[PDB]
Amino acid sequence: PYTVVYFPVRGRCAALRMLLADQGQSWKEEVVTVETWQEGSLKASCLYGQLPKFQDGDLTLYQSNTILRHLGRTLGLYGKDQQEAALVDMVNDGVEDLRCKYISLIYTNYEAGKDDYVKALPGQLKPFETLLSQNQGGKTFIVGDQISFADYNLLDLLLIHEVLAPGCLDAFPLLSAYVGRLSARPKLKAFLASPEYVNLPINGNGKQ
Amino acid sequence: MPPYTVVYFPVRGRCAALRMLLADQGQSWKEEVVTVETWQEGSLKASCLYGQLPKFQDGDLTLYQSNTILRHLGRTLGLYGKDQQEAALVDMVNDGVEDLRCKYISLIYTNYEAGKDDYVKALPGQLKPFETLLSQNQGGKTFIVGDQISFADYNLLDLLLIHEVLAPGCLDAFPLLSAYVGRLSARPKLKAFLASPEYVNLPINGNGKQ
């Protein structure tokens, strides 16, 4: 255990938080405010001038996907073997691609871009439905028979997209059932219901 | 028959680093070349998981996403750190490389004329973290993480090479990055590959800009 240093928002920490909670891990949240970030000191000290910053004992990490991979590796949430690990990466990189588009919409082009984005969304989600359809008929996880860090990241992606574009999973039965199934995992369900999650905004600019 | 196949456009692009990796590791592979015309016809595109190349085959394992391919070769070829902590540092570097790569790609393909000057001026601030990493690892005399090569080295190396083409002398401010490029580039099999027609006669990008 484990310190997450981040703004008071869900953003790029939501998936790794869901992971730690569902895995019964303990961690410390160090919350960084607007004024503190503007002051410049903390920012200058971050490897790539960005949060999150993550501490695991004497190890300091940056990059949300690095933190996800590290937790995946250390907690056995990275597939059963190398072949599965590659598939886990393949899913997570696809989640990250759509997250980058989501982030660009939210922070740079929300008013003008939202219509085009929502129109494009079904074709962006379809690959994850297809992956589910090709793995145990979508009844288990995104890769293999055990949960991986990519499940937490995909789940987050789908949750924030349901806020953006209500009904966006209605055409996708496997993704729909997967969101319900994962969201019901007792520790995860508890975390999702908690004010620690519910009372943080998704993003830092009031848009969702 | 080689167990690896790379399916891609006739471009260095997101395949340069994984090819450098394969070549330097003495692994054999097939290049399947996809023309703009074929891509435009749409059926291969439709069959790709995320509608994009590269596509990579390792036996009957089919992968998409360049960093997925690098990580996979990283695992199977032992280029992913000596232990779990190193593996995370390797990821942290590679994600950093990827972030600057996206910025580079955005410049090249969407904003070359109007964005280049601003890009070149922001460049030192974007390269500095890699210098810092080098400086904190054996005085920058070996690799980007620990004392053995990783997939992040090949990705970083590619990123620095393409940046020297975009902005000649951009590593003059970064003695450790400069010496590192020289050192990695001189590895015998890599040096030979980098000099070869199969590398030299491909353009860096798909649109004629660099």
Ligand SMILES: C=C(CC)C(=O)c1ccc(OCC(=O)O)c(Cl)c1Cl
């Ligand atoms: C090198 C690449 C080929 C695999 C690549 O990443 C890439 C990314 C985005 C692109 O769209 C333009 C844009 O809006 O960025 C294009 Cl045209 C390419 Cl070639």
Ligand SMILES: [Ca+2]
């Ligand atoms: Ca497990």
Ligand SMILES: [Cl-]
């Ligand atoms: Cl974010």
